[PDB]
């Protein structure tokens, strides 16, 4: 009865941080939800009852979160186990930690704690186990991801890939992560021994949903300098074999950035992830009680929509969201703890718990976090972020990009407000 | 107007007899479907010896003997008007040709190929848009493809174990382009300057990919010469117990002369104990009484007699011996 | 109660899963398995806490997915069962649960013989040299058609429903019992429905207006058939009748991943556009000609007495 | 020597006039790579025309017209011989090769009637080379004035007939509907255009990708969900393939479907046509002149089971996907022709606008 | 019409006679000796049988300017029944017998014949307290036909207007 899995929640993508400082990666919401519960519901969709969540940092936050989850309840089916250690600073370090601890049985699943997907692996998982058992126990990995656009907005310029594949075995002939490049070379230990017809494809994207067995565990007991999945799969290519699995049905990807986070939140609300839809309200409270309407818009509890306040496309709102009149909001998410003035236009913005905003704050393309305040006529420009009790007064026509949070040396304010020191 | 096509006189006549002088073979197969206006460009004393050919037409143009292959084009340019379905020497003609030329009609590119049954050509999963090439020797650099040419097309196929066919379905603007750029010869290697992505004639370049085999091009190619294509009508014997062969007109066929995948030429005196071949046997022959054969193309004026010995070694023209034991290496015969 | 909790979470986990397998026959037998077991699970000293039990259960499995609603009205039929058994003790404890078990057993005895009764109702309407048109299938639909074809001759012409197709499944399923079908594109109905003379569809659930939310593309063909005034026949049983009303609730049309209706391979097109498509349609109740229930043909507005004496219409709290 | 063409599989008895033809065979398996009768540029653009990339009616008419341009650009009539009747005696077997390569879409029938009109007009005792020159000049000025001047006049009417705050749907495909919508958009108007298509084709991905490269918001679905869009839209546009004599818009697969469900929720319809897109003959409904495309293309990529894969082994099995269909006159409200916003049943007035009478 | 169109195809014509006094049976016996396998029925059974008809002609005698048609009686109820099944309506009249006149501009363009053909003169005592009247000609609006056919080809219901105005000097309405 093969049903095993394991989770990880550690990255270090220092391009568009310090959002990972006090509300870290592992409790970053979409609309007052848990992304780890998105991964966790996906591994309920696997059919596996056993998982092992990896903490990165702020373990007491996981202690409070998973004590009020669905899975705190011992009556629940899909049990979640946990590791308690703050000494560890990579991807594969905790992997070889749990594998020297050696409580991992067989043919499991590793995935990162950001991934939202809805593909049932049991049409491809048992296919992997077929390739394992009937053929030599050597095809040790099958990473699995989705047929895509030749240029999609959720495949951004820092994580784009291109893969040479077999004609029909779907085994990897070549993989290369190609950030910071414009042209494409190819290694040649895969071409005349592959006398079957070579398939090179440019339309896929890499997402870390590795189903694998503890032969992989021994293959990174082998090279202690291995840290990531990238040098695993590139240590495959030096000679214990790998396939891929492309599909034509679903959407599975990740983010460590903010950019394809905005893309995947656009994918959630116009619902490229059905069955998994945020109005079935799979996590258990009444603090997410919103319905449907025209144009895929959603209205929670204590709505209070303003007179003439049109609210057209692809948004929702949570609890305690007082809305003023004559506002105009499209393709975005307002979360709970919200108050609105008048003419408060939002566009592709993010308004998490406790936020406030004054009237006339004409703001486009934001990303904004816990219990923040912003005053009248703050015109604000795309690709910026605000975090953790910001206060900005009147007549700031703030520029394009400005990370504004409590840290001096990287964020562009200090422990006081963000106009001037 | 489309109706121009010619075989190249070189590949890259006198010797390569599969069963005929080889240029006889593609001419009846291009004349198979139309082309009552056609040229046969020669290059030499082989220009006016075509009484056995029963033409509707020919244009026998001689040329210089020492040349390449675009020299023919720069020589023949004051006589052509339209589409050029140019052929060459060492190509099989064993396949449908109508679908490649109406593919040239169908998908509005200037060119087409036959790519049918150390070489890496790039075709799409649609299988009609070729992209680029790689070979066994020139691509000693690994292989590099460019960004936009692979960003406009998301997936690609590499047909690998497959030969060139030396086929070209090309129209007039490339040939007067070659008159302008008269520098680059070697039409087999003029297609790395293809420029799908970037202008004196938004431009497209395609090809076509039954799947039988092709001939090796060094000098002989007679492994394709053993061809049972669709022996017909001659003066026969009804005494030779032999099948999968061709009869010999104006020849001496009798009994005791077996030909297993062979033929009988003109004045082939095979009526005593001749042997089965798995090989070729041309005209003016007299080979029997144990004239064994294996891998042995017996050319014109053939002689192997009195318990002859030959195995895994071809023969040529000007042989007159009885006990000349041809060893299993293909030796000078 | 160990078994009740795991079985209700297994039921809601296949409810949030979605389609597959076919329809509400297997979903119906899952509901009555739940309901049978949850009277044999846990004690009660009155019926009121049992109502608290089953009301909490019904509200959770209804708020699981209000797309399909046979779960709800099977809860409502066991609610009329418990009401008529809570009457005829005073009309406190003993005979109740046995009565519940036997009454739901006769519910099984009815609902197993539904398609055979529709087959018995089949040979009254259609005859030779005719034509007939459908949209998708429940199994009742090809039951009706293949049993009609078991003695008689016709020529069925079928447009599917395709945001994703499943009418092809019925098309092949009665290609192989000798019917001579034509499968039609989902737009050229109006070209041929002038020549068709009867039209029969099979829905998924029918509601308290005497109305019907059906598979996709049913409203359009229904209005088209009204334009030629040719009669359109709902072959839905007495089993799907539900006290919902169309715009009382929140969007009984609800929606799927549009990769169902878009190939993902088109390029940078999809970012600005917010595509959407529902699972159902809505046909107004003026437009059905005649039901085909198990008991016989009934009026298109024969519905409120069906609810007043086939349910407990005070228990529309659900 | 005489071209023939066969049929493919099971066939509906109701369509004795127009047969079914499959897109998966050659048209040179009966005639050679040359042909002493048929012209190479003609079989070039006809084989272009047959496979199904030359899709739009305006585009296929200009393709056929430039094919005929290449015909009479070089055609030497041999002497001791008459010009006009021998030209039609050669070019109408060419029309037979056209209609047997792929059947008629009668705008090009109006084109070849125009060609007859022009070849019998210029005489034969006239010297014929400059007659060819003025003839090719006549036909190409004809086709550019028709196509682009009708497109500009319909755009000129269309500048005013779209409101603001409204929306609009489109169905079908042509270059003119794209010119209409983007040349409506880029002048300060603000309206999102939902786009609806059908199966087996989803043709209007063309119009959707043109419209999003014109930078206009959208939402996309199919006419068996067109029961959802009728609460939202405020006016409905359609395309048109051909214009039948009593005001029937002979048009794309689901046109009259959308017209019926449009004024089933009472949102008025609006179509677009032009000058030469009017025939002479008249009919009642679909079952006379309506082509069939590929049968087997009905397919879903779901799992491992193509649910019409084994089509050919069945014999008591049929299928249809009619594409080129009709509409009753009193639900199409009016056309936008170049002559103006003119109502439907008033269309066939243009038969005697010829002799100023 | 049917004599030409039956000689190369096969169809199934059904005919309800125009019977204040019948002559549609004379049509039936006239065309039935070429054998198209036709049926006749009573004039009051037409409504149910148009669920299984798909098209209907009307052979009229007088067509007027306003697109309406002034045919034999029984055509109005058959026209309304074909309206309530949406089968197309064609009228096979030539351009020849088109009139410019107008319906209630003409003072009762109807003409009644003797009611002997409806109440026969073997009636007994019933007659002298009951009015009885039957037209030969009824009136059916322009709204309901769809397809003319003529010498020059088919035309719209509205398009007979130009046929009037070009085929008649438009002030000879005074005869």
| DSSP states along A329-356 | EES-EE-SSEE--SS--EES-EE-TT--
**Bridge partner list, A223:** none
Asked if residue E75 lies in contact with residue E140, where contact means CB atoms within 8 angstroms, the answer is yes
Inter-chain touch C229–E84, beta carbons under 8 Å: yes
Probe site for chain D from B34, B56, B103 (most D CB atoms < 10 A) = B34
Cα(A188)–Cα(B300) distance, integer angstroms: 48
Cα(B103)–Cα(B128) distance, integer angstroms: 9
Cα(D310)–Cα(D308) distance, integer angstroms: 6
Name the residue among D247, D284, D345 with its Cβ closest to that of E55: D284
Identify the residue whose tokens are 């010829």.
Answer: D354
H helices of E32-159, in order, are 46-49, 75-83
Task: Find all residues with CB under 8 Å of C293, minimum gap 6, and list them.
Answer: C236, C237, C238
- Report CA Rg, chain C: 21
Asked if residue D198 lies in contact with residue D222, where contact means CB atoms within 8 angstroms, the answer is yes
**Count of alpha carbons within 13 Å of C236, Cβ hemisphere only?**
26
Q: How many contacts, defined by CB atoms under 8 Å, are there between C and E? A: 14
Q: Is D136 an 8 Å CB contact of chain C? A: no
Q: Which two tokens stand for residue D149?
A: 């001047």
Q: Does an interface of 3+ CB pairs under 8 Å exist between A and E?
A: no
**Shortest alpha-carbon distance between residue B285 and chain A (Å):** 44
Task: Identify which of E68, E28, E29, E56 has the alpha carbon closest to the alpha carbon of residue E164.
Answer: E68
Name the residue among D280, D347, D352 with its Cβ closest to that of E153: D280
Task: Identify which of D21, D7, D29 has the alpha carbon closest to the alpha carbon of residue D50.
Answer: D21
Q: Which residues of B touch A195 (CB under 8 A)?
A: 160-161
Probe site for chain A from B135, B136, B151, B209 (most A CB atoms < 10 A) = B151
DSSP 8-state class, residue C138: -
Asked if residue B19 lies in contact with residue B246, where contact means CB atoms within 8 angstroms, the answer is yes
Is residue E81 domain-resident? yes
Cα(B289)–Cα(B285) distance, integer angstroms: 13
Cα(C30)–Cα(C40) distance, integer angstroms: 15
Identify the residue whose tokens are 């305006």.
Answer: D58
Probe site for chain A from B142, B158, B161, B162 (most A CB atoms < 10 A) = B158
Q: Does an interface of 3+ CB pairs under 8 Å exist between A and B?
A: yes
Inter-chain touch C266–A153, beta carbons under 8 Å: no
Task: Identify which of A303, A398, A373, A384 has the alpha carbon closest to the alpha carbon of residue A349.
Answer: A384
Which bin fits C163, alpha (ψ -120 to 50), beta or left (φ > 0)?
Answer: alpha
Q: What is the resolution of this structure in A?
A: 4.6
Q: Which residues of A380-409 are buried (b: 16+ CB within 10 A; e: fewer)?
A: beeebbbbbebebeeebebeeebbbbbbee
Handedness of CA D135, D137, D140, D145 (dihedral sign): negative
Q: Which two tokens stand for residue A81?
A: 């186990």
The vertex-D218 CA angle with D217 and D222, nearest 5°, equals 175
Inter-chain touch C264–A148, beta carbons under 8 Å: yes
Name the residue among E90, E147, E156 with its Cβ closest to that of D348: E156
**Bridge partner list, C201:** C234
Q: Which residues of C touch A300 (CB under 8 A)?
A: none
- Could you tell me whether strands D248-250 and D242-244 are parallel, antiparallel, or unpaired per DSSP bridges? antiparallel
**Bridge partner list, D248:** D244
Cα C269 to the chain's mean position, in Å?
37
Stated as kind and residue range, the H or E segment containing C242 is strand C241-242
Helices D40-51 and B98-106 pack at an angle, to 10 degrees, of 80
Inter-chain touch C185–D199, beta carbons under 8 Å: yes
Burial class (CB in 10 A: 0-12, 13-18, 19+), C93: exposed
Cα(B282)–Cα(B119) distance, integer angstroms: 36
Which bin fits E35, alpha (ψ -120 to 50), beta or left (φ > 0)?
Answer: left
Q: Is D232 an 8 Å CB contact of chain C? A: no
Residue C167's domain comprises 119-309
Chains sharing 3 or more CB pairs under 8 A with chain B: A, D
Name the residue among A183, A197, A200 with its Cβ closest to that of B144: A183
DSSP 8-state class, residue C249: S
What Cα–Cα distance (Å) separates residue A24 from each residue in A27, A146, A388, A399?
6, 28, 12, 26
3-state secondary structure of B195: coil
Q: What chain B residue is nearest to D26 in terms of C-alpha separation?
A: B99
What Cα–Cα distance (Å) separates residue C246 from each residue in C212, C243, C252, C283, D225?
9, 10, 7, 10, 17
Structural domain spans, chain D? 1-153, 154-356
Count other Cβ atoms within 10 Å, centred on residue A262.
24
Q: Which residues of A touch C276 (CB under 8 A)?
A: 270-271, 295-296
**Shortest alpha-carbon distance between residue D189 and chain E (Å):** 37
**Bridge partner list, C207:** C242
Identify the residue whose tokens are 């007699």.
Answer: B305
Q: Is B118 an 8 Å CB contact of chain A? A: yes
Inter-chain touch A149–C255, beta carbons under 8 Å: no
Cα(A257)–Cα(A11) distance, integer angstroms: 10
Q: Which residues of B touch A194 (CB under 8 A)?
A: 160
Identify the residue whose tokens are 């496309």.
Answer: A313
Cα(C209)–Cα(C304) distance, integer angstroms: 8
Asked if residue B257 lies in contact with residue B240, where contact means CB atoms within 8 angstroms, the answer is yes
Identify the residue whose tokens are 């697969």.
Answer: D253
Q: Which two tokens stand for residue A156?
A: 């951004």
DSSP 8-state class, residue B291: B
Cα(B302)–Cα(B310) distance, integer angstroms: 13
Q: Is A200 an 8 Å CB contact of chain B? A: yes
Task: Find all residues with CB under 8 Å of B85, minimum gap 6, and list them.
Answer: B4, B5, B30, B101, B167, B168, B169
**Shortest alpha-carbon distance between residue C141 and chain A (Å):** 27
Task: Identify which of A338, A389, A318 has the alpha carbon closest to the alpha carbon of residue A22.
Answer: A389
Probe site for chain D from B105, B106, B109, B112 (most D CB atoms < 10 A) = B105
Q: Which two tokens stand for residue C136?
A: 């998708």
Q: Which two tokens stand for residue C97?
A: 């649960």
Q: Which two tokens stand for residue B108?
A: 């509005």
3-state secondary structure of A175: strand
Q: Which two tokens stand for residue D115?
A: 């060609």
**Shortest alpha-carbon distance between residue C164 and chain A (Å):** 12
Inter-chain touch B151–A202, beta carbons under 8 Å: yes
Asked if residue D319 lies in contact with residue D298, where contact means CB atoms within 8 angstroms, the answer is yes
**Shortest alpha-carbon distance between residue C226 and chain E (Å):** 9
Q: Which residues of A touch C63 (CB under 8 A)?
A: 281
Q: Give the number of residues written for chain C.
A: 318
Which class is domain A4-258? alpha beta
Q: Which two tokens stand for residue A274?
A: 């059905």
Cα(A259)–Cα(A348) distance, integer angstroms: 11
Task: Identify which of A357, A302, A301, A353 has the alpha carbon closest to the alpha carbon of residue A329.
Answer: A357
Asked if residue E76 lies in contact with residue E141, where contact means CB atoms within 8 angstroms, the answer is no
Q: Which two tokens stand for residue D174?
A: 């042509």
Q: Which residues of C touch D196 (CB under 8 A)?
A: none
The vertex-A259 CA angle with A254 and A260, nearest 5°, equals 30
Q: Which residues of C touch A271 (CB under 8 A)?
A: 255-258, 276
Asked if residue D108 lies in contact with residue D60, where contact means CB atoms within 8 angstroms, the answer is yes
| DSSP states along B134-191 | -BSSS--S--EE-TTTTTSS-EEEEE-S------EEE-HHHHHHHHHS-S---GGGSS
Which bin fits A309, alpha (ψ -120 to 50), beta or left (φ > 0)?
Answer: beta
Asked if residue A92 lies in contact with residue A228, where contact means CB atoms within 8 angstroms, the answer is yes
Q: What chain D residue is nearest to E55 in terms of C-alpha separation?
A: D284
Number of helices (H), then strands (E), belonging to chain E: the values are: 5, 7
Q: What are phi and psi of D117, to 5 degrees?
A: -55, -40
Cα(C54)–Cα(C76) distance, integer angstroms: 10
What Cα–Cα distance (Å) separates residue C33 from each residue in A76, C6, C99, C104, E135?
21, 13, 16, 10, 72
- Rounded to the nearest 5 percent, the helix, strand and coil shares of chain C are 40, 10, 50
Task: Find all residues with CB under 8 Å of A299, minimum gap 6, and list them.
Answer: A290, A291, A293, A305, A316, A317
Residues after which chain C has a gap (C–N > 2.5 Å)? 91
Asked if residue D201 lies in contact with residue D223, where contact means CB atoms within 8 angstroms, the answer is no
CATH code for the domain of C230:
3.40.50.10470
- Report CA Rg, chain D: 22
**Shortest alpha-carbon distance between residue A166 and chain B (Å):** 10
**Shortest alpha-carbon distance between residue D333 and chain E (Å):** 15
Q: Which residues of C touch A44 (CB under 8 A)?
A: 13
Cα(D64)–Cα(D70) distance, integer angstroms: 10
Q: Which residues of A touch C275 (CB under 8 A)?
A: 270
| DSSP states along D72-103 | HHH----SSS-SHHHHHHHHHHHHHHHHHHS-
Specify the long-range contacts of residues E130-134, CB closer than 8 Å, at least 24 apart: E134/E20, E134/E73
Q: Is A201 an 8 Å CB contact of chain C? A: no
DSSP 8-state class, residue A20: T
**Bridge partner list, B135:** B119
Q: Which residues of E10-22 are buried (b: 16+ CB within 10 A; e: fewer)?
A: eeebeebbbbbee
Cα(C313)–Cα(A74) distance, integer angstroms: 38
Cα(A343)–Cα(D11) distance, integer angstroms: 64
Inter-chain touch B105–D35, beta carbons under 8 Å: no
Asked if residue A250 lies in contact with residue C258, where contact means CB atoms within 8 angstroms, the answer is no
Stated as kind and residue range, the H or E segment containing D62 is helix D57-74
Number of independent structural domains in chain E:
1
Inter-chain touch A291–C254, beta carbons under 8 Å: no
Q: Which two tokens stand for residue B8?
A: 């190249």
Residues after which chain A has a gap (C–N > 2.5 Å)? 239
Name the residue among A182, A187, A198 with its Cβ closest to that of B142: A187
Inter-chain touch E154–D352, beta carbons under 8 Å: no
Specify the long-range contacts of residues D27-31, CB closer than 8 Å, at least 24 apart: D27/B102, D27/D101, D28/B33, D28/B98, D28/B102, D29/B98, D30/D3, D30/D4, D31/D3
Q: Which two tokens stand for residue D112?
A: 């070849």
Cα(D332)–Cα(D343) distance, integer angstroms: 9
């Amino acid at each position: 009865p093969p049903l095993q899995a394991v989770l990880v929640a550690d990255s270090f993508d220092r391009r568009f941080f310090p959002i990972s400082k006090d509300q870290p990666r592992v409790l970053l919401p979409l609309a007052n939800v848990a992304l780890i519960d998105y991964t966790l519901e996906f591994l309920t969709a696997t059919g596996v009852q056993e998982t092992f969540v990896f903490c990165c940092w702020k373990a007491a936050q996981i202690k409070e979160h998973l004590l009020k989850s669905k899975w705190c309840r011992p009556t629940s089916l899909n049990v979640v186990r946990i590791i308690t250690s703050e000494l560890y600073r990579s991807l594969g370090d905790v992997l070889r930690d749990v594998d020297a601890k050696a409580l991992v049985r067989s043919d499991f699943l590793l995935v990162y704690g950001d991934v939202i997907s809805n593909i049932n692996i049991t049409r491809a998982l048992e296919e992997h186990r077929l390739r394992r058992k009937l053929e030599k126990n050597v095809s040790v990995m099958t990473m699995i991801f989705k047929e895509s656009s030749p240029s999609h907005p959720t495949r951004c310029h820092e994580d784009n890939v291109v893969v040479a594949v077999d004609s029909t075995t779907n085994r990897v002939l070549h993989f290369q992560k190609t950030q910071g490049l414009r042209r494409f070379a190819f290694p040649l230990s895969l071409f005349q021994g592959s006398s079957d017809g070579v398939e090179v494809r440019y339309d896929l994207l890499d997402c870390h949903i590795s189903i694998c067995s503890p032969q992989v565990a021994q293959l990174f007991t082998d090279n202690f300098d291995y840290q990531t999945r990238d040098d695993f799969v590139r240590g495959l290519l030096v000679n214990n074999q790998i396939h891929m699995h492309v599909t034509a049905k679903e959407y599975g990807a990740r983010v460590s950035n903010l950019h394809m986070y905005s893309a995947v939140c656009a994918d959630v609300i116009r619902r490229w992830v059905y069955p998994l839809t945020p109005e079935a309200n799979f996590t258990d409270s009444t603090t997410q009680s919103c319905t449907h309407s025209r144009h895929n818009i959603y209205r929670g509890p204590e709505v209070s929509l303003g007179h003439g306040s049109i609210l057209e496309e692809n948004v929702l709102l949570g609890s305690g969201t007082v809305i003023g009149s004559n506002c105009f909001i499209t393709n975005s998410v307002i979360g709970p703890g919200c108050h609105i003035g008048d003419n408060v236009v939002l566009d592709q913005t993010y308004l998490w718990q406790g936020v406030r905003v004054a009237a006339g704050a004409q703001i486009h393309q934001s990303l904004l976090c816990d219990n923040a305040e912003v005053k009248e006529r703050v015109t604000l420009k795309p690709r910026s972020v605000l975090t953790s009790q910001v206060v900005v007064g009147p007549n700031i026509t703030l520029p394009e990009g400005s990370v504004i949070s409590l840290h001096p040396p990287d964020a562009e304010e200090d422990e006081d407000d963000g106009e001037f020191s | 107007m489309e109706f121009q096509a010619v075989v190249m006189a070189v590949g890259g006549p006198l010797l390569p007899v599969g069963n005929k002088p080889l240029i006889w073979y593609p001419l009846n197969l291009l004349e198979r479907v139309g082309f009552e206006e056609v040229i046969v460009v020669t290059t030499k004393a082989l220009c006016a010896e075509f009484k056995m050919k029963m033409k509707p037409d020919i244009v026998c143009i001689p040329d210089d003997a020492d040349m390449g292959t675009a020299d023919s084009l720069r020589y023949i340019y004051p006589k052509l008007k339209t589409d050029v379905l140019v052929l060459s020497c060492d190509l099989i003609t064993d396949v449908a040709l109508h679908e490649v030329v109406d593919l040239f009609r169908a998908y509005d590119a200037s060119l087409a190929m036959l790519m049918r049954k150390r070489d890496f050509i790039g075709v799409d999963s649609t299988g009609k848009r070729l992209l680029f090439m790689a070979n066994e020797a020139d691509l000693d650099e690994e292989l590099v493809i460019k960004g936009s040419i692979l960003q406009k097309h998301p997936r690609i196929r590499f047909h690998t174990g497959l030969v060139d066919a030396h086929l070209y379905c090309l129209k007039k603007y490339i040939v007067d382009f070659l008159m302008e750029n008269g520098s680059i010869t070697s039409i087999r290697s003029e297609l790395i300057p293809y420029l799908v992505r970037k202008s004196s004639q938004s431009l497209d370049i395609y090809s076509f990919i039954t799947l039988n085999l092709a001939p090796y091009d060094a000098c002989w190619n007679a492994c394709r010469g053993d061809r049972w294509e669709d022996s017909s009508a001659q003066i026969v014997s009804k005494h030779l117990v032999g099948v999968d062969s061709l009869i010999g007109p104006e020849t001496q066929i009798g009994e005791k002369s077996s030909i297993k995948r062979s033929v009988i030429g003109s004045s082939c005196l095979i009526k005593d104990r001749v042997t089965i071949t798995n090989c070729l046997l041309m005209n003016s022959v007299t080979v029997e009484e144990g004239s064994n054969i294996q891998g042995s193309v017996i050319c014109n004026n053939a002689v192997i007699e009195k318990g002859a010995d030959i195995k895994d070694c071809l023969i040529g023209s000007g042989q007159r011996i009885e006990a000349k034991a041809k060893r299993v290496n293909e030796v000078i015969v | 109660g160990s078994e009740l909790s795991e079985r209700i979470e297994s039921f809601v986990e296949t409810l949030k899963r979605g389609g597959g397998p076919r329809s509400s026959e297997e979903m119906a037998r899952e509901t009555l398995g739940l309901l049978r077991q949850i009277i044999t699970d846990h004690r009660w000293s009155n019926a009121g806490e049992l109502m608290e039990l089953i009301r909490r259960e019904g509200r959770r499995m209804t708020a699981a997915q209000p797309s399909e609603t046979t779960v709800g009205n099977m809860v409502r039929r066991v609610l009329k069962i418990i009401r008529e058994e809570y009457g005829r003790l005073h009309g406190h404890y003993a005979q109740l649960q046995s009565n519940i078990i036997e009454a739901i057993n006769e519910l099984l005895v009815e609902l197993e013989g539904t398609m055979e009764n529709i087959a018995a109702q089949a040979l009254e309407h259609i005859h030779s040299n005719e034509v007939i048109m459908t949209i998708g299938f429940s199994r009742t639909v090809e039951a009706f058609l293949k049993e009609a074809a078991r003695k008689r001759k016709f020529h069925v012409i079928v447009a599917e429903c395709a945001p994703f197709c499943q009418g092809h499944e019925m098309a092949v399923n009665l290609s192989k019992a000798g019917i001579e079908t034509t499968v039609m594109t989902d737009a050229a109905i109006f070209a041929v429905m002038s020549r068709v003379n009867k039209v029969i569809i099979g829905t998924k659930t029918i509601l308290a207006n005497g109305a019907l939310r059906a598979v996709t593309g049913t409203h359009t063909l229904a209005l088209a058939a009204k334009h030629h005034s040719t009669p359109l026949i709902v072959c839905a049983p007495m089993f799907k009748l539900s006290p919902q009303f169309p715009n009382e609730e929140d969007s009984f049309h609800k929606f799927v991943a549009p990769e169902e209706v878009l190939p993902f391979t088109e390029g940078d097109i999809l970012e600005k556009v917010s595509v959407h498509c529902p699972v159902f349609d809505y046909v107004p109740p003026e437009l059905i000609t005649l039901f085909i229930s198990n008991i016989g043909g009934n009026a298109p507005s024969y519905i409120y007495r069906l609810m007043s004496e086939l349910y407990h219409p005070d228990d529309h709290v659900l | 020597q005489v071209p023939t063409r066969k049929d493919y599989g099971s066939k509906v008895s109701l369509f004795s006039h127009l047969p079914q033809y499959s897109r998966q065979n050659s048209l040179t398996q009966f005639m050679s790579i040359p042909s002493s009768v048929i012209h190479p540029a003609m079989v070039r653009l006809g084989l272009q025309y047959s496979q199904g990339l030359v899709s739009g009616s305006n585009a296929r008419c200009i393709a056929l017209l430039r094919a005929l341009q290449q015909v009479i650009q070089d055609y030497t009539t041999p002497p001791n011989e008459e010009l006009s009747r021998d030209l039609v005696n050669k070019l109408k077997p060419y029309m037979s090769f056209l209609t047997q390569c792929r059947p008629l879409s009668a705008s090009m029938h109006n084109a070849i009637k125009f060609l007859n009109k022009e070849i019998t007009s210029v005489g034969s005792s006239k010297r014929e080379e400059e007659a060819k020159s003025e003839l090719r000049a006549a036909i190409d000025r004809y086709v550019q004035e028709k196509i682009v001047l009708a497109a500009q006049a319909i755009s000129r009417f269309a500048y005013q007939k779209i409101s603001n705050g409204d929306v609009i749907l489109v169905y079908g495909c042509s270059s003119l509907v794209s010119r209409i919508l983007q040349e409506a958009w880029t002048e300060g108007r603000r309206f999102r255009v939902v786009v609806v298509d059908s199966r087996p084709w989803l043709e209007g991905r063309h119009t959707l990708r043109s419209l999003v490269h014109a930078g206009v918001p959208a939402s996309y679905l199919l006419i068996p969900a067109a029961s959802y869009v009728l609460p939202e839209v405020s006016k409905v546009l359609l395309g048109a393939h051909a214009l039948l004599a009593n005001g029937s818009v002979m048009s794309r697969v689901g046109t009259a479907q959308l017209a019926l469900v449009a004024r089933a929720h009472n949102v008025p319809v609006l179509v677009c046509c032009e000058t030469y897109k009017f025939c002479e003959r008249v009919q009642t409904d679909a079952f006379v002149s309506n082509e069939l495309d590929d049968p087997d293309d009905l397919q879903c990529k779901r799992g491992e089971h193509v649910a019409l894969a084994n089509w050919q082994n069945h014999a008591s099995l049929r299928l249809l996907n009619l594409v080129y269909d009709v509409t009753p006159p009193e639900l199409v409200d009016l056309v936008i022709t170049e002559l103006g916003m003119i109502p439907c049943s008033s269309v066939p007035v243009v038969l005697r606008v010829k002799s100023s009478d």
